């Protein structure tokens with residue numbers, strides 16, 4: 001099913017929703033896939049997450065030009081690590097307005113990333129403060145608490161069965177929680193469960209480093225996270 005386009009892979013998940021996948025060759029971990037999303041909302045496109053690098057992110061935009069040929073109205077990036085924010089300059093060179101958690105933008109420089117141009121803030125229940133998320137279309141942005149990182153956010157796609165956990169969530173057969181270098185080991189389990197609770201009807205869980213899975217990804221991730229505390 002998957003479309004190969006240069007060194008990236010694109011898979012349609014639902015009407016109007018595609019998964020983008022990019023790779024980085026890192027001894028110790030093989031060629032590491034990272035996934036994000038592309039959403040068509042009528043006459044515009046929305047992107048969730050960059051690729052690892054600026055060049056790869058430019059290739060995402062080239063795939064969008066070829067396959068959709070509509071403007072990319074905005075991108076939201078789900079925390080300040082390179083698999084999610086490595087390509088910010090490519091977005092900015094393309095004139096795309098970029099959004100991230102306020103805390104991601106503050107952490108971006110120390111993580112070697114370029115901040116998004118706009119900051120999202122969150123209400124006490126975890127839902128994005130509306131004034132900070134203009135024109136988000138079907139993207140429903142939720143801060144579940146600290147986990148994979150302090151700043152990690154998640155995104156549901158209204159009108160679909162899809163919720164994106166980014167690097168917070170691992171698939172139901174995952175043998176570890178992957179990169180824990182910036183993790184909050186105390187709060188991870190709860191944050192994973194809060195993601196699930198925010199998007200109860202989402203039966204397709206999309207994530208950064210596994211193929212899409214059932215909601216067993218959420219329960220399994222949270223059980224792996226229980227053991228870090």
Ligand SMILES: [O-]
Nearest residue numbers: 081083167179
């Ligand atoms: O990451």
Ligand SMILES: [Zn+2]
Nearest residue numbers: 079081148167
């Ligand atoms: Zn990360």
Ligand SMILES: [Zn+2]
Nearest residue numbers: 083167208209
């Ligand atoms: Zn990651």
